Amino acid sequence: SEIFLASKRAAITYDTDPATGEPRAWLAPGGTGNVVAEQAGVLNISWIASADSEDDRRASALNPDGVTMELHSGREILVRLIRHDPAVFRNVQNFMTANLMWAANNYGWDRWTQPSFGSDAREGWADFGRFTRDFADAILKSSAQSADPVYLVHDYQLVGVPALLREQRPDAPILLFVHIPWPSADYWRILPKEIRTGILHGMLPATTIGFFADRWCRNFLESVADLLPDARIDREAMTVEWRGHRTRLRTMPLGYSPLPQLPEGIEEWADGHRLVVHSGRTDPIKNAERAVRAFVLAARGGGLEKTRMLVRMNPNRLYVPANADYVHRVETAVAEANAELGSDTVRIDNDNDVNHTIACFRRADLLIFNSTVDGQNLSTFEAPLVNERDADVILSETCGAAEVLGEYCRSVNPFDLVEQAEAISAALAAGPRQRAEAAARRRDAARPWTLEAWVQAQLDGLAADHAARTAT
Amino acid sequence: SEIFLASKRAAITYDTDPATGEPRAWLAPGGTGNVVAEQAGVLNISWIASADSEDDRRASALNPDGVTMELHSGREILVRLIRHDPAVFRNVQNFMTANLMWAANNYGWDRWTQPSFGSDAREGWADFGRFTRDFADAILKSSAQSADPVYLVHDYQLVGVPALLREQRPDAPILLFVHIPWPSADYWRILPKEIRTGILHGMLPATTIGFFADRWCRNFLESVADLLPDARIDREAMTVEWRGHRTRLRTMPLGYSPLPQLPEGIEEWADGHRLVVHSGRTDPIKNAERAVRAFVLAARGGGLEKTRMLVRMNPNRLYVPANADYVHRVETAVAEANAELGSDTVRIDNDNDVNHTIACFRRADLLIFNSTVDGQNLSTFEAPLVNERDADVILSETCGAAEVLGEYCRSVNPFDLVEQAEAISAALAAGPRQRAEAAARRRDAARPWTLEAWVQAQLDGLAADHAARTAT
Ligand SMILES: Nc1nc2c(ncn2[C@@H]2O[C@H](COP(=O)(O)OP(=O)(O)O)[C@@H](O)[C@H]2O)c(=O)[nH]1
Ligand SMILES: Nc1nc2c(ncn2[C@@H]2O[C@H](COP(=O)(O)OP(=O)(O)O)[C@@H](O)[C@H]2O)c(=O)[nH]1
Ligand SMILES: [Cl-]
């Protein structure tokens, strides 16, 4: 079985050997390609992604057809980076941020005042076409010798790719996985006509479309039914038929990859106190502002003396106005929490260190993952799995993760400050035994959903859907 | 057949007789009750609504059981106004504005930043319950003598009423009509748990729930399926079964009621120019800001010389921040349109004269009803029916009206400025013959949807659903 994996980025580490000083390049561990390469059915794999750095650009120019990279067990993966036109790639990246598509799939628009699509939306869509073509060409090039290529297409940026693959390769298995939500039909069609229909056209020729959650699958089907009068959907079978394409929709949850010190000052600042931890990158969906306001409402209700709150953020796309504004709104809430509850009750630690975040998970006496919406949210699996304080988890009901862990957490409406405040109070009032037992159940529910099982689900699902599509 | 009609307001005109000077109270023509009273099946009718004025309060106190009011043809209707506790009433009215429920059903929230429900949402919901109880009691009291009462409950404010009527009258036909949209399940859900489920609990005991549009019916069914695990929906039959209640959903479109001078300065200002007219009350859903920006994009494109634009607004609930902000955003756009295109290219006429609005409809060379969303939008039926300039209509695809007239207008995504600009230019470029022919088809499509046909649809639909509910 010859695998061709496309994703937006292939995590490649660039450095010099500490002994020789020679340039070396190596794949990061836990990479999707790495895991796929270890599966039993896989004879070989190539990984196609975008050059997004100067090192990537250089590497791509050095090895245009791709560079073979070694893995443990003597396994190898052919990694090919694509050098897009910079202005195009640059524009497509802004098309993918909360300036457009991110707001579209992650529910960022109020409709009354935003959005208002101008000529920029048309240019962005044109550029997205050129970007999609670049990927399709690279992927087909890489797989030109292969008799029965299997295509795995990951990431929202590559939604246009399946249709182009299918045009050249009518009988190939093609899986598209989308890692973010799919919005309601009424919300999806906020997008300009050529975008709202063109993205569906790009996706449907896949054999299999996977999302992290049932809700996303249903929303996707409703979008298809709403916009594509030629399309026939079946909500029980989770299938679309459209211009002879039969597409199967699947839910394939992911939880975590099985693969330290707290940030400076945090351990002493937190000592002698119960610690509420909210963690997520600097993205408005992570909902930290509301978490802080809820924490304040809870503290007004008392019992929350000797309780502090940490807002751990990983800076990301701060150049996008919605992101910078989110951080600004969070700072405001934190400043106001401190003013009201007393100094240093709430801290933000905003910083990119995965290890610091895991230490925060371990230290927490209460974990809050109260996203406005989330495609899945892996942090809510990771955190209970490493936490050794029997911390309760408050989980928003709109995280894809809630479909798996909702029953084992305090599931909340992420927009209700009162409901969230009451959950904070109850979580902190709960006794050691009750928390110990609930934590154990939570860890049991989270444990099975590993990166490897999720990869196996993709391969198995695609195989079954490939047989079905062939028969029909 | 003894009809009991409940709505939020019964339009009553209070004055003195110009000859005698004696106090006069008379039902406004074209009221819903008036029309229902004229239907063939109807033996008598009572109308229950809220006292919302000093005159109403006084009239209610004078005739607590209700006052018989004469209609043409010697028909009469018993009109009973309810005196609610003022603080409860005042708070329920704010619950019903864009501060809460209006944003819920008319898609006003971005989720990332709004809303954040606090204790006010809980108090608002408590007050809503007291208000709902007031209406149910008054309705039951008015109909206490009736052997087989038929209940027609109109307006969103009365969504809680059917359940209370059903508790006391298990076998009565009850229709609830909702005049505004129903949002996608993911969006409805934003609401606090006790509200999002409590409202469904209140509505479902109706025999029949009507909306102006299919899309609303579907979104309602999805909301039920999403939140009420006990409920069984059928999307083809348009039914819900829940706790022994069988509820039928129906689409019952309304267009217009079959029943002058332009505002000061408008005729002369508009003379020698083609006139683009956008009309709607001061509510963010009417989308005038975007209409103006689109007009500007179109005028940049040229051909739009000797073209002016009127933004006709009817001031409503200006005390609501969303509404005042909308008017503010519209002024800003108009000011900027003039600065760019030349002085006095665009005018706002903001003012409650309904005859004036009709004159604007008649004068228009192009009509724009580009709502972000609209329960139905009757203006888009009225305007082509009175227009005598063969004006094209630009209609948002998110108005319930688009399900009936969409094919006969220029249907647009209300969030796409470019698409809307291109429709403005094409509509103004089109020749007299093509417009004359399109206007005639438009008027033919609009004409059948009268107030009376809509009332007949309700009675017929309810009757059929009552038989069905009885059998099952
Ligand atoms: N690079 C980096 N990753 C982090 C940091 N903190 C947490 N993470 C990881 O980033 C991932 C976040 O994924 P998820 O919770 O699904 O939210 P997402 O960011 O929307 O994918 C988790 O695997 C976290 O363990 C950090 O400071 N830096
Ligand atoms: N009272 C009043 N009514 C108006 C005015 N202008 C238009 N109307 C009428 O108000 C109604 C507007 O209804 P519709 O277009 O469905 O939008 P709605 O305002 O959301 O109900 C139409 O019947 C118009 O003819 C005005 O200035 N004052
Ligand atoms: Cl929606």
Ligand SMILES: [Cl-]
């Ligand atoms: Cl939605």
